Amino acid sequence: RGWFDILDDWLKRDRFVFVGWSGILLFPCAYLALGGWLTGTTFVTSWYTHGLASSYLEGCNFLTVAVSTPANSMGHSLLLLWGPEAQGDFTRWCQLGGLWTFIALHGAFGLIGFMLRQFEIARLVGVRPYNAIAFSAPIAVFVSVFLIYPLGQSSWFFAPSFGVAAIFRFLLFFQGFHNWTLNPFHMMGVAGVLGGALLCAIHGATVENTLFQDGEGASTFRAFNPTQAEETYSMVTANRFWSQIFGIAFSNKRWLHFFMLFVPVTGLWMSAIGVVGLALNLRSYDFISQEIRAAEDPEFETFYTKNLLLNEGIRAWMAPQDQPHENFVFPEEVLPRGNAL
Amino acid sequence: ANLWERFCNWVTSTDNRLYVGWFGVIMIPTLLAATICFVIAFIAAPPVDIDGIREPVSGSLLYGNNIITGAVVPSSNAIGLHFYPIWEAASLDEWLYNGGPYQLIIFHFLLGASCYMGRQWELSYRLGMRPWICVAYSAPLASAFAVFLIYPIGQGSFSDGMPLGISGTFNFMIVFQAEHNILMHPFHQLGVAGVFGGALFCAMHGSLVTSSLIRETTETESANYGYKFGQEEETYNIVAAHGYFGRLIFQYASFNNSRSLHFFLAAWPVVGVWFTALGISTMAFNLNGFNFNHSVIDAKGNVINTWADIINRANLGMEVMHERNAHNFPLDLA
Amino acid sequence: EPNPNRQPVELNRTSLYLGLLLILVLALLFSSYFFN
Amino acid sequence: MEVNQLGLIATALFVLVPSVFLIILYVQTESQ
């Protein structure tokens, strides 16, 4: 038995936490994404990169801590610890944003390792790998938002920082500068996520309220044996219910659960496409025909023009502090403002 | 029997292609009126003075909108919370100008949808089903009540209810963040966990059941034909899906009771969306998101900005531009 | 000498209904952007 | 409104071509 085969045996042992070959990629990279997030939100600042506090140490709370992106001046540097910027100096690495690339890139390889883990376990247990396929949607989101988007922009500065309110900042940036709500690729992703939540809730409720009586207790959970042959609920009565409530119903159990995979997985994929567009500022920002009319007809107003006025307010009021490396100076008198406020 | 009994029996017949039921008796007319008005107004309604300042907003396709920009516009701020039926106007022309279709649509729709929920209970009784599907639906229904009724009540005007349009929805969301910092509200963060987690668990359950379909077909036909409607037996191996998923994470982070698993799928999105509906409903009374503006300061007292201060600069940009002609006094108190 | 890999193809009514709803709703979504 | 008049033909074919595809596959299914 070759040494490769003995290592294989031990890595695929049935234990409490399955390891595997994929583990060799997954466990180190995942631990270090996690650990670098905890470490940076607990102890590290964003003062030299952003002009912001970002750690518990500095008095932030769980909503306002972040591992923040590196300064715009770093471009798309990998910001390796041993690289030319930090020159092996750990303390300076932290101060320049190395933990951001550290987390981002170990996280990327950890998601790879997780998907291969889903592939590796499916093969050993003997089931189809549709779960791994489903996990392509989270991977596309992560790659598009965290890597592709900043690689199209001037630097890693404009990627998402790893924090709750930092992400909220990102949401509002995307509204004010990209008009992302208007983008059909996001619109589709919204449909897929809210449609997946809908599917989740309505399938759970439908099953729970069409159960057969299989025990005699009032708690119905105890009347199910994972080894039973029988369906625990009635497809036939479920079907009739929804046919008469809603007009149509599912009749095929396989189609129904394939549809549950498809809808959310397809939504996140469509959102990823639009962010790739925004990597290039290829936005769906405007409707030319409305702008031609509006510029000519000062009485023409729609919810589309109202929203742009809000976008314009966001950009000017937030850019000086949000992009400090630009030294935007906006005198009071240039700031756009409606009456009174 | 007699006439009223033939009628009762028809209304509650489990043999009608679509169940009517006593709730249906209210649902059908109210939804029909809401739908017909909405379709006509969306296409043809003329501009509506939403904010009460004689600055009408065009919401309809014939007045220069497309599918994305069009809306049925909320009724005038001059009206506030007053009831504005057609018969209270001096003319349809006055009613259209002040946004009457909006009141008509949303009242008939909240009624109709409240009765849709009752109808779900009602049919489950006639079928001998357990009754709590309607509970699940209470989460979406509650959410619609919040943006169309509760938020206008707290703020004192239907003019601040949600518009019935794609872009109008966005307007409402941006103004909301400006005035309530909803992103920083835990009930909205619970809503996002609800729907994200719902999407996740949705993909998981589907992926995991699909992963363990029993070979009952060839490679040239759809796997789906391996399931026959009403078949006694199950067409996937739940024990194998547990064996996969239990190893993916660990054995007890995985469900092996089909009933416990499906109850979880029901409860996660429903509870979360309950919270985010309650979030709109309580921000309706100006109990707003966490405020951490200038919360960190240094030994001298300089403000050391956080990401919360950066959010606040976006919020301020929304604040000072929205409804740009509508404020005469420095505070926007509702 | 007829080719033995030929297969017959199927689309049931439900799939047609689903596929038509998909197309139509996509058209309704994207058309505003095509007119711009 | 000063729209893109190529939008009409784009929308029309966006609909017709794939719909026809579906119809054709469905009808030949029902006839065997």
Partner: peptide
């Protein structure tokens, strides 16, 4: 022409609903 196009697409969907409910393949217990 744009208004007509939006309304036509919306009207085809409504007709699709009618056929999909009332002219569905009936679910049968085989």
């Amino acid at each position: 022409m744009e208004t007509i196009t939006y309304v036509f697409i919306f009207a085809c969907i409504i007709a699709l609903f009618f056929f999909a409910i009332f002219f569905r393949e009936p679910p049968r217990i085989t």
